[PDB]
Coordinates of C-alpha atoms in Angstrom, one line a residue:
Chain H
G54 CA 12.2 -0.1 24.7
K55 CA 12.2 3.0 22.4
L56 CA 9.4 5.5 22.3
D57 CA 7.0 7.2 19.7
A58 CA 4.0 8.5 18.8
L59 CA 0.7 6.8 18.2
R60 CA 0.8 8.4 14.5
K61 CA 3.3 10.5 12.2
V62 CA 3.3 12.1 8.9
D63 CA 6.0 13.4 6.5
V64 CA 3.6 16.5 4.9
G65 CA 4.7 17.7 1.3
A66 CA 3.7 19.4 -1.8
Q67 CA 2.9 18.1 -4.9
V68 CA 4.1 21.6 -6.8
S69 CA 7.2 23.6 -7.5
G70 CA 7.3 27.0 -6.3
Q71 CA 9.0 29.3 -3.7
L72 CA 7.7 29.2 -0.3
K73 CA 6.3 32.7 0.6
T74 CA 5.5 32.0 4.0
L75 CA 5.4 29.6 6.7
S76 CA 2.6 30.7 9.3
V77 CA 3.1 28.2 12.2
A78 CA 6.4 27.9 14.4
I79 CA 7.2 24.6 16.0
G80 CA 5.4 23.4 19.4
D81 CA 2.1 25.1 18.4
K82 CA -1.1 22.7 18.2
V83 CA -2.9 22.6 14.7
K84 CA -6.4 21.5 13.8
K85 CA -7.2 19.2 10.8
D86 CA -7.7 21.2 7.5
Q87 CA -5.8 24.3 8.9
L88 CA -3.7 26.4 6.6
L89 CA -0.1 25.7 7.0
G90 CA 2.7 27.1 4.4
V91 CA 1.8 28.8 1.2
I92 CA 3.8 28.1 -1.7
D93 CA 3.7 31.1 -4.7
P94 CA 0.4 30.8 -6.5
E95 CA 0.7 33.5 -9.4
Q96 CA 1.1 31.0 -12.0
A97 CA -2.0 29.0 -11.3
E98 CA -3.8 32.1 -11.2
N99 CA -2.6 33.2 -14.8
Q100 CA -3.9 29.4 -16.2
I101 CA -7.0 30.3 -14.5
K102 CA -7.7 33.6 -15.9
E103 CA -7.0 32.3 -19.2
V104 CA -9.4 29.5 -19.1
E105 CA -11.9 32.2 -17.7
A106 CA -11.0 34.1 -21.1
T107 CA -11.6 31.0 -23.2
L108 CA -15.0 30.7 -21.4
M109 CA -15.9 33.9 -22.4
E110 CA -14.7 33.5 -26.0
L111 CA -17.1 30.4 -26.5
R112 CA -19.7 32.6 -24.4
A113 CA -19.6 34.9 -27.2
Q114 CA -19.2 32.3 -30.0
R115 CA -22.6 30.4 -29.0
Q116 CA -24.1 33.8 -28.8
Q117 CA -23.6 34.0 -32.8
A118 CA -25.3 30.6 -33.3
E119 CA -28.1 31.3 -31.0
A120 CA -28.8 34.5 -33.4
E121 CA -28.3 32.1 -36.5
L122 CA -30.8 29.6 -35.5
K123 CA -33.2 32.3 -34.9
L124 CA -32.8 33.2 -38.6
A125 CA -33.2 29.9 -39.6
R126 CA -36.3 29.3 -37.4
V127 CA -38.2 32.2 -38.7
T128 CA -37.2 31.3 -42.3
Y129 CA -38.8 28.0 -41.5
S130 CA -41.8 28.7 -40.1
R131 CA -42.4 31.7 -43.0
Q132 CA -41.9 29.1 -45.5
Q133 CA -44.5 26.9 -43.9
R134 CA -47.3 29.4 -43.3
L135 CA -47.0 29.8 -47.1
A136 CA -46.6 26.2 -47.7
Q137 CA -49.9 25.3 -46.7
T138 CA -51.0 27.1 -49.5
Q139 CA -48.5 24.7 -51.5
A140 CA -45.5 27.0 -51.4
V141 CA -42.7 26.8 -53.7
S142 CA -42.3 22.8 -53.8
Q143 CA -41.4 20.8 -51.0
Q144 CA -37.7 21.3 -52.0
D145 CA -37.5 24.7 -50.1
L146 CA -39.4 22.9 -47.4
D147 CA -36.5 20.4 -47.2
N148 CA -34.1 23.3 -47.6
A149 CA -35.4 24.8 -44.3
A150 CA -36.1 22.0 -42.4
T151 CA -32.8 20.5 -42.7
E152 CA -30.9 23.9 -42.2
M153 CA -32.5 24.6 -39.1
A154 CA -31.3 21.1 -37.9
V155 CA -27.7 22.2 -38.7
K156 CA -28.0 25.5 -36.8
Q157 CA -29.6 23.3 -34.0
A158 CA -26.6 20.8 -34.0
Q159 CA -24.3 23.7 -33.9
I160 CA -25.3 25.1 -30.7
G161 CA -24.8 22.1 -29.1
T162 CA -21.4 21.5 -30.7
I163 CA -20.7 24.8 -28.9
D164 CA -22.2 23.6 -25.6
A165 CA -20.2 20.5 -25.3
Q166 CA -17.0 22.8 -25.7
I167 CA -18.1 24.8 -23.1
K168 CA -18.7 21.7 -21.0
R169 CA -15.2 20.4 -21.8
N170 CA -13.7 23.8 -20.7
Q171 CA -15.8 24.3 -17.7
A172 CA -14.3 20.4 -17.2
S173 CA -10.8 22.0 -17.6
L174 CA -11.6 24.7 -15.2
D175 CA -11.6 22.1 -12.1
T176 CA -8.4 21.0 -13.7
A177 CA -7.2 24.6 -13.6
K178 CA -8.4 25.4 -10.0
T179 CA -7.0 22.1 -8.5
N180 CA -3.4 23.1 -8.8
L181 CA -4.3 26.0 -7.2
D182 CA -5.2 24.1 -4.1
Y183 CA -2.1 22.2 -4.1
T184 CA -0.3 25.5 -3.5
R185 CA -1.7 26.2 -0.1
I186 CA -0.6 23.1 2.2
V187 CA -3.1 22.0 4.9
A188 CA -2.4 19.4 8.0
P189 CA -3.8 15.9 7.0
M190 CA -4.3 15.4 10.8
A191 CA -4.4 16.9 14.2
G192 CA -1.3 17.1 16.3
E193 CA 1.5 19.5 17.2
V194 CA 4.1 20.2 14.8
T195 CA 7.5 18.6 15.6
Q196 CA 10.0 19.5 12.9
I197 CA 10.6 22.0 10.2
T198 CA 13.3 20.9 7.3
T199 CA 12.1 23.6 4.8
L200 CA 12.7 26.9 6.1
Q201 CA 10.9 29.8 4.8
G202 CA 12.0 31.3 1.6
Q203 CA 13.8 28.5 0.1
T204 CA 13.3 27.7 -3.8
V205 CA 11.7 24.2 -4.2
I206 CA 10.8 21.7 -6.9
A207 CA 9.2 18.6 -7.0
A208 CA 9.6 16.8 -10.1
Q209 CA 11.2 13.7 -8.3
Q210 CA 11.1 13.1 -4.5
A211 CA 8.0 14.7 -2.7
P212 CA 9.6 17.7 -0.9
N213 CA 9.8 17.5 3.3
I214 CA 8.3 20.8 4.4
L215 CA 7.3 19.6 8.1
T216 CA 6.5 16.6 10.1
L217 CA 3.4 16.0 12.6
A218 CA 2.6 13.6 15.3
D219 CA -0.4 12.8 17.7
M220 CA 1.2 13.1 21.2
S221 CA -1.9 11.9 23.0
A222 CA -0.7 8.2 23.2
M223 CA 2.7 7.1 23.1
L224 CA 3.3 3.6 21.3
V225 CA 6.6 1.7 22.7
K226 CA 8.7 -0.4 20.6
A227 CA 9.9 -3.0 23.1
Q228 CA 12.4 -5.0 21.1
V229 CA 12.2 -8.4 23.0
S230 CA 14.9 -10.8 21.8
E231 CA 14.4 -13.6 19.2
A232 CA 15.2 -16.0 21.6
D233 CA 11.7 -15.4 23.8
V234 CA 9.5 -14.2 20.6
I235 CA 8.0 -18.0 20.8
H236 CA 5.8 -16.9 23.6
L237 CA 4.7 -13.5 24.2
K238 CA 0.9 -14.4 23.6
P239 CA -1.2 -11.2 23.1
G240 CA -2.8 -9.7 26.0
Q241 CA -0.5 -10.6 28.7
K242 CA -0.2 -7.3 30.7
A243 CA 3.2 -5.5 30.9
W244 CA 4.7 -2.5 32.5
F245 CA 7.8 0.0 31.7
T246 CA 9.7 2.9 33.4
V247 CA 12.0 5.4 32.3
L248 CA 15.4 6.3 33.1
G249 CA 15.0 9.8 34.1
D250 CA 12.4 9.8 36.6
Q251 CA 13.5 6.4 38.1
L252 CA 10.3 5.1 40.0
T253 CA 7.2 6.3 38.5
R254 CA 5.6 2.9 36.9
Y255 CA 3.7 2.9 33.8
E256 CA 1.6 0.1 32.6
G257 CA -0.9 -1.5 30.0
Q258 CA -1.8 -4.3 27.8
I259 CA 0.3 -5.5 25.0
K260 CA -1.0 -4.7 21.8
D261 CA 0.8 -6.8 19.1
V262 CA 3.8 -7.9 17.8
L263 CA 5.6 -6.4 14.3
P264 CA 6.4 -9.1 11.8
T265 CA 9.5 -7.5 10.3
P266 CA 12.4 -7.7 12.5
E267 CA 15.4 -5.2 12.2
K268 CA 18.8 -6.4 13.4
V269 CA 21.9 -4.5 15.0
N270 CA 24.6 -6.4 13.5
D271 CA 24.5 -9.4 16.0
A272 CA 21.1 -10.9 17.3
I273 CA 17.6 -10.6 15.4
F274 CA 15.2 -8.7 17.7
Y275 CA 11.4 -8.5 17.5
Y276 CA 9.3 -5.3 18.7
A277 CA 6.1 -5.2 20.8
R278 CA 3.9 -2.2 21.4
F279 CA 1.8 -0.8 24.2
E280 CA -0.7 2.1 24.5
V281 CA 0.2 4.4 27.3
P282 CA -2.0 7.1 28.3
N283 CA 0.0 10.5 28.4
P284 CA -1.5 13.3 30.3
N285 CA 0.7 16.0 32.1
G286 CA 2.4 16.6 28.8
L287 CA 5.1 14.4 29.6
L288 CA 7.0 11.5 27.7
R289 CA 9.3 13.3 25.0
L290 CA 9.7 11.2 21.6
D291 CA 12.3 8.2 21.7
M292 CA 13.2 8.5 25.1
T293 CA 14.7 5.3 26.5
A294 CA 12.4 2.9 28.5
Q295 CA 13.1 0.0 30.6
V296 CA 10.5 -2.7 29.6
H297 CA 9.1 -5.3 32.0
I298 CA 6.7 -7.6 30.0
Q299 CA 4.9 -10.3 31.7
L300 CA 6.1 -13.5 30.7
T301 CA 3.2 -15.7 32.6
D302 CA 1.0 -15.7 35.7
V303 CA 1.7 -19.3 36.5
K304 CA 0.0 -20.0 39.7
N305 CA -0.9 -22.5 42.5
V306 CA 2.7 -24.0 41.4
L307 CA 5.7 -24.4 43.6
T308 CA 9.0 -22.8 43.0
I309 CA 12.5 -23.7 44.4
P310 CA 14.9 -21.0 46.0
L311 CA 18.0 -20.6 43.9
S312 CA 20.5 -21.6 46.9
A313 CA 19.0 -24.8 47.9
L314 CA 19.0 -26.8 44.4
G315 CA 21.6 -29.0 42.9
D316 CA 22.2 -29.4 39.2
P317 CA 23.4 -33.0 38.3
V318 CA 24.4 -33.9 34.6
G319 CA 23.1 -30.6 33.1
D320 CA 19.4 -31.5 33.1
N321 CA 19.0 -33.4 36.3
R322 CA 18.3 -31.5 39.4
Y323 CA 18.4 -33.1 42.8
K324 CA 16.6 -31.3 45.6
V325 CA 17.2 -32.5 49.3
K326 CA 14.1 -32.2 51.5
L327 CA 12.9 -33.0 55.0
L328 CA 10.8 -35.9 55.3
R329 CA 7.9 -36.4 57.5
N330 CA 10.4 -39.4 58.7
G331 CA 12.8 -36.2 59.7
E332 CA 14.9 -38.0 57.4
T333 CA 16.1 -35.8 54.6
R334 CA 16.0 -37.2 50.9
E335 CA 16.5 -35.8 47.2
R336 CA 14.4 -35.9 44.6
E337 CA 15.3 -35.3 40.9
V338 CA 12.7 -32.2 39.7
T339 CA 12.2 -31.0 36.0
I340 CA 12.6 -27.3 36.0
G341 CA 12.7 -25.2 32.6
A342 CA 11.1 -22.1 34.1
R343 CA 13.2 -19.9 36.0
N344 CA 13.1 -16.5 37.8
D345 CA 16.2 -14.0 39.2
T346 CA 15.2 -15.6 42.7
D347 CA 13.4 -18.8 41.7
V348 CA 13.4 -21.7 39.5
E349 CA 9.7 -22.7 38.9
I350 CA 9.1 -26.3 39.9
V351 CA 5.6 -27.1 38.2
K352 CA 6.6 -30.9 39.4
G353 CA 8.9 -32.6 41.1
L354 CA 8.3 -32.0 44.8
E355 CA 5.2 -33.1 46.7
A356 CA 3.8 -29.6 48.5
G357 CA 4.4 -28.6 51.8
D358 CA 7.6 -30.8 52.3
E359 CA 10.5 -28.7 53.9
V360 CA 13.6 -28.1 52.1
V361 CA 17.2 -27.5 53.4
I362 CA 18.0 -24.1 52.0
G363 CA 21.5 -24.8 53.2
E364 CA 24.1 -27.4 53.4
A365 CA 21.5 -29.8 51.4
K366 CA 22.7 -33.4 52.4
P367 CA 20.7 -36.5 50.8
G368 CA 19.8 -39.2 53.1
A369 CA 20.7 -37.0 56.1
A370 CA 18.2 -36.3 58.9
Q371 CA 18.4 -32.9 60.1
Chain U
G54 CA 20.2 -21.0 8.1
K55 CA 18.2 -17.6 7.6
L56 CA 14.3 -17.5 7.4
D57 CA 11.9 -16.2 5.2
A58 CA 8.5 -16.1 3.6
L59 CA 7.5 -18.7 0.4
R60 CA 6.8 -15.4 -1.6
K61 CA 7.3 -11.8 -1.0
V62 CA 6.0 -8.9 -3.1
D63 CA 6.6 -5.0 -2.7
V64 CA 3.5 -2.8 -4.2
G65 CA 4.0 0.7 -5.6
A66 CA 1.9 3.1 -7.7
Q67 CA 2.4 4.5 -11.4
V68 CA 0.9 7.9 -10.3
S69 CA 1.6 11.3 -8.3
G70 CA -0.8 12.4 -5.7
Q71 CA -1.5 12.9 -2.0
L72 CA -2.5 9.5 -0.2
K73 CA -6.1 10.3 1.1
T74 CA -6.1 6.8 3.0
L75 CA -4.9 3.6 3.7
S76 CA -7.4 1.4 4.9
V77 CA -5.4 -1.9 5.8
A78 CA -3.9 -2.2 9.4
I79 CA -0.3 -4.2 9.5
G80 CA -0.9 -7.9 10.3
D81 CA -4.5 -7.6 9.1
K82 CA -5.1 -10.7 6.0
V83 CA -5.8 -9.6 2.4
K84 CA -7.6 -11.5 -0.3
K85 CA -6.4 -11.2 -3.8
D86 CA -7.4 -7.8 -5.8
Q87 CA -8.5 -6.5 -2.5
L88 CA -8.4 -2.3 -2.2
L89 CA -5.8 -1.0 -0.5
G90 CA -4.7 2.7 -0.3
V91 CA -6.3 5.3 -2.3
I92 CA -4.3 8.0 -4.0
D93 CA -6.3 11.2 -5.0
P94 CA -8.6 10.9 -7.9
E95 CA -9.6 14.1 -8.9
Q96 CA -7.6 14.5 -11.9
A97 CA -8.4 11.6 -13.4
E98 CA -12.1 12.4 -13.2
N99 CA -11.4 15.9 -14.9
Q100 CA -10.2 14.3 -18.0
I101 CA -12.7 11.6 -17.8
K102 CA -15.3 14.1 -17.9
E103 CA -13.5 16.1 -20.5
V104 CA -13.3 13.3 -22.7
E105 CA -17.1 12.7 -22.4
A106 CA -17.9 16.3 -23.4
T107 CA -15.7 15.2 -26.6
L108 CA -18.0 12.5 -27.0
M109 CA -20.9 14.8 -26.9
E110 CA -19.3 17.0 -29.3
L111 CA -19.3 14.3 -31.9
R112 CA -22.2 13.2 -31.0
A113 CA -24.0 16.4 -32.1
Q114 CA -21.7 16.8 -35.2
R115 CA -22.7 13.3 -36.2
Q116 CA -26.5 14.7 -36.0
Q117 CA -25.7 17.3 -38.5
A118 CA -24.2 14.7 -41.0
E119 CA -27.3 12.6 -40.4
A120 CA -29.8 15.5 -41.8
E121 CA -27.8 16.5 -44.6
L122 CA -27.6 13.0 -45.7
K123 CA -31.3 12.9 -45.6
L124 CA -31.4 15.9 -47.6
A125 CA -28.9 14.8 -50.6
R126 CA -30.6 11.2 -50.8
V127 CA -34.2 12.6 -51.1
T128 CA -32.9 15.2 -53.5
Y129 CA -31.5 12.5 -55.6
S130 CA -34.3 10.1 -55.7
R131 CA -36.6 13.0 -56.8
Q132 CA -34.0 13.8 -59.3
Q133 CA -34.4 10.0 -60.7
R134 CA -37.9 9.9 -60.6
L135 CA -38.1 12.4 -62.9
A136 CA -35.0 11.0 -64.5
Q137 CA -37.1 7.9 -66.1
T138 CA -38.7 10.4 -68.0
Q139 CA -35.1 11.8 -69.1
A140 CA -34.8 14.5 -66.8
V141 CA -32.0 17.2 -67.4
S142 CA -29.6 15.0 -68.6
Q143 CA -27.6 12.5 -66.6
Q144 CA -25.6 15.6 -65.6
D145 CA -27.7 16.7 -62.5
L146 CA -28.0 12.7 -61.8
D147 CA -24.1 12.9 -61.6
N148 CA -24.3 16.2 -59.7
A149 CA -26.7 14.5 -57.1
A150 CA -25.4 10.6 -56.9
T151 CA -21.8 11.9 -56.2
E152 CA -22.9 14.5 -53.3
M153 CA -24.8 11.5 -51.5
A154 CA -21.4 9.7 -51.8
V155 CA -19.9 12.7 -50.2
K156 CA -22.6 12.7 -47.1
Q157 CA -21.8 9.1 -47.0
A158 CA -18.4 9.5 -46.4
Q159 CA -18.8 12.3 -44.3
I160 CA -20.7 10.1 -41.7
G161 CA -18.0 7.4 -41.6
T162 CA -15.4 9.8 -41.0
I163 CA -17.2 10.8 -38.3
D164 CA -17.7 7.8 -36.8
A165 CA -14.2 6.9 -37.2
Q166 CA -13.7 10.1 -34.8
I167 CA -16.3 8.4 -32.1
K168 CA -14.4 5.4 -32.8
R169 CA -11.0 6.7 -31.8
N170 CA -12.3 8.6 -29.2
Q171 CA -14.1 5.8 -27.2
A172 CA -10.7 4.1 -27.6
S173 CA -9.2 7.0 -26.0
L174 CA -11.8 7.0 -23.2
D175 CA -10.5 3.4 -21.9
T176 CA -7.0 5.5 -21.8
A177 CA -8.9 7.9 -19.7
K178 CA -10.3 5.5 -17.3
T179 CA -7.3 3.4 -17.0
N180 CA -5.1 5.9 -15.2
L181 CA -8.3 6.0 -12.6
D182 CA -7.7 2.5 -11.8
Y183 CA -3.6 3.0 -11.0
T184 CA -5.0 5.4 -8.4
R185 CA -6.7 2.8 -6.4
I186 CA -3.8 0.2 -5.3
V187 CA -5.0 -3.3 -4.9
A188 CA -3.1 -6.3 -3.4
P189 CA -1.2 -8.8 -6.4
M190 CA -1.7 -11.7 -3.8
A191 CA -3.1 -12.8 -0.5
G192 CA -1.0 -12.4 2.4
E193 CA -0.4 -10.1 5.6
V194 CA 0.8 -6.5 5.4
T195 CA 4.5 -7.1 6.7
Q196 CA 5.3 -3.3 7.0
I197 CA 3.8 0.3 5.7
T198 CA 7.0 2.1 4.2
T199 CA 4.5 4.9 3.4
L200 CA 2.2 6.5 6.4
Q201 CA -1.0 8.1 5.7
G202 CA -0.9 11.5 4.2
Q203 CA 2.2 11.8 2.8
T204 CA 2.6 13.4 -0.7
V205 CA 4.0 10.8 -3.2
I206 CA 5.4 11.1 -6.6
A207 CA 5.4 8.3 -9.1
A208 CA 7.7 10.5 -11.7
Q209 CA 10.5 8.3 -11.1
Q210 CA 11.6 5.3 -9.1
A211 CA 8.3 3.4 -8.1
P212 CA 7.3 4.3 -4.5
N213 CA 7.6 1.5 -1.9
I214 CA 3.8 1.7 -0.4
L215 CA 3.4 -1.5 1.4
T216 CA 5.2 -4.9 1.3
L217 CA 3.5 -8.1 1.4
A218 CA 4.4 -11.8 2.2
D219 CA 2.5 -15.2 2.2
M220 CA 3.2 -17.2 5.3
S221 CA 1.3 -20.2 4.5
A222 CA 4.7 -22.0 4.2
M223 CA 8.3 -21.1 5.2
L224 CA 11.5 -21.1 2.8
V225 CA 14.6 -21.4 4.5
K226 CA 17.8 -20.1 3.4
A227 CA 20.7 -22.8 4.5
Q228 CA 24.0 -21.3 3.7
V229 CA 26.2 -24.3 3.2
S230 CA 30.0 -23.4 2.8
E231 CA 31.5 -23.5 -0.8
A232 CA 33.9 -26.5 0.1
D233 CA 30.9 -28.7 0.6
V234 CA 28.5 -27.3 -2.4
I235 CA 30.1 -30.1 -4.6
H236 CA 28.1 -32.5 -2.9
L237 CA 24.4 -32.0 -2.0
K238 CA 22.6 -33.7 -4.2
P239 CA 19.1 -32.6 -4.6
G240 CA 16.1 -34.8 -2.7
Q241 CA 18.6 -35.9 0.4
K242 CA 16.4 -35.3 3.3
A243 CA 17.5 -32.6 6.1
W244 CA 16.0 -31.1 9.3
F245 CA 16.4 -28.0 11.3
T246 CA 15.8 -26.2 14.9
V247 CA 15.1 -22.9 15.8
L248 CA 17.2 -21.4 18.9
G249 CA 14.5 -20.2 20.8
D250 CA 12.5 -23.1 21.1
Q251 CA 15.7 -25.1 22.0
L252 CA 14.4 -28.9 21.0
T253 CA 11.4 -28.7 18.5
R254 CA 12.8 -30.7 15.3
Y255 CA 11.2 -29.7 11.7
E256 CA 12.1 -31.6 8.9
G257 CA 11.8 -32.0 5.1
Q258 CA 13.1 -32.6 1.6
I259 CA 15.7 -30.1 0.2
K260 CA 14.6 -28.5 -3.0
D261 CA 17.6 -26.9 -5.0
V262 CA 20.7 -24.8 -4.6
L263 CA 20.6 -21.4 -6.0
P264 CA 22.9 -20.6 -8.8
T265 CA 24.1 -17.2 -7.3
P266 CA 26.5 -16.8 -4.4
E267 CA 26.9 -14.2 -2.2
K268 CA 29.7 -13.4 0.3
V269 CA 30.5 -11.8 3.8
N270 CA 34.1 -10.9 3.3
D271 CA 36.2 -13.9 3.4
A272 CA 34.9 -17.3 2.3
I273 CA 31.8 -17.6 -0.6
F274 CA 28.7 -19.3 0.6
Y275 CA 25.8 -21.1 -1.2
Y276 CA 22.3 -21.1 -0.3
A277 CA 19.7 -24.1 0.0
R278 CA 16.1 -24.4 0.5
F279 CA 13.4 -26.4 2.2
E280 CA 9.7 -26.4 2.3
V281 CA 8.4 -26.3 6.0
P282 CA 4.7 -26.6 6.6
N283 CA 3.8 -23.7 9.1
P284 CA 0.9 -24.8 11.6
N285 CA -0.2 -22.6 14.4
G286 CA 1.2 -19.4 13.0
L287 CA 4.9 -19.9 14.6
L288 CA 8.6 -18.8 13.3
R289 CA 8.8 -15.1 12.5
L290 CA 10.5 -13.9 9.5
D291 CA 14.1 -13.6 9.7
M292 CA 14.5 -16.2 12.8
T293 CA 17.8 -17.8 13.2
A294 CA 17.5 -21.7 12.6
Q295 CA 20.4 -24.0 13.3
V296 CA 20.4 -26.6 10.0
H297 CA 21.1 -30.1 9.5
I298 CA 21.7 -31.3 5.9
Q299 CA 22.0 -35.1 5.4
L300 CA 25.9 -37.2 3.9
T301 CA 25.7 -41.1 3.6
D302 CA 25.2 -43.8 5.9
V303 CA 27.6 -46.6 5.3
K304 CA 26.9 -49.4 8.1
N305 CA 28.5 -52.5 9.4
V306 CA 31.7 -50.7 10.0
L307 CA 33.8 -49.7 12.7
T308 CA 34.5 -46.0 13.1
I309 CA 37.4 -44.7 15.5
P310 CA 37.0 -41.7 17.9
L311 CA 39.3 -38.9 16.8
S312 CA 40.0 -38.4 20.5
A313 CA 43.0 -41.0 20.8
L314 CA 44.1 -41.6 17.3
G315 CA 47.9 -41.9 16.1
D316 CA 49.0 -40.6 12.8
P317 CA 52.3 -41.4 11.9
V318 CA 53.6 -40.3 8.4

């Protein structure tokens, strides 16, 4: 069994630029959305000042139309007030009511520009946020691939500045062989131990099985995972771990000691037993399940029959 | 015999951006067009608001020409109503009717702009849909190459976010040797069994033979496929499977065991 963190992340950054600083050394805890490294932000500040200058430009250009609208409006009312006395035709009234509509449209046409550029301002600011890396999730820093002061560019692979892992629950990769994967029903109880502490058993429920195998040349293997609690700060990553995965909990069922059983043919299993008569007799027994010390016998021998652990002899009374 | 899913599809994304979330867990079932991961969509929303602001701009600029068209039209009819009594020659009638054609063309010239920009709006929105990955087909999530929170860039090769596979039925890769490939007529009946269950026969029709061989150093090998049903969720991917393909059964005829044969010449 291989060992790893419950969750792990390879943090990166979208933008190119020199890495001016990296505030955190490895081994320090970091809370979510904490500041990390800081890529150079001079350029983004430049486009921001540029866009703000554009908004100022429209801020004045609107101020022009604001005055022309006053001119057209006062001209219109000043025409109508004389126009109740039938001023210089309805012609000029149509020359006044329409121009005011034009100046009215102009200010809105400018407001749309202020709208699109303020909308662009978010596009300007959003690039600036990319320069300042923040942690997606809590967990002490593991490894720093990108050392401080290195130039970096991101037009291809996402750069690997650093990595993170949540060391509070150590998932295990128990690579059970393909020969036994057919069993291994979920929720079966299992335990494991590490080579370095010899005898300090850990245990828990099996969680699930990974659909995708990865071979080591010969023999396919399939993983399985637990969820062991990790206090004390022990259990380093990728530590070797011997794993005992509960195969089954059969009960109220007999098992035959290995020393006594006979195995005719290659499937048959003679087993001499003492009888109530006191005369021993063998019985063929069906056994598939087996342990290091015993073979499980669900069927083949009546309970309480004595069995000849040594020098077994069919038809031979003790 | 190697074993694999009836269909398997890797999934990518067309756009760069931090992966804010990946709601699916591995082994979960997913129906077609279900939402999966979500790359950050702030940018696409920005271009969307920008384009909508442009449509607002033309929305007013058209309103201007709408007024000028009223002016030119009222001026024209008010010229013609006098013109039945011979107003100021046909000269001003030509100075009026032509202007109305201009104001007429102007609004259409603007409507074409509203058309091209509404057409551009689909170009804006379509990028936003790329940010939200959806599953091409039903299946369970076999693997997640890309863990949550990783930065990803699609300026080059399509990233492998997560693979999918359909396990409703299992296909087998039965690699028959090149020496025997000349036989093996399609539809010949065959069966197989896994090493891990010892004795539990599966069986079915052979489907076909793959045209393109792949080799393991020495000796070429050609594949063949079945289509075994998969009840109860058994048979993990890439499980080893011993495979018996059927040659002919001529009968009513003796066959000598090879153990004691004598073969002079």
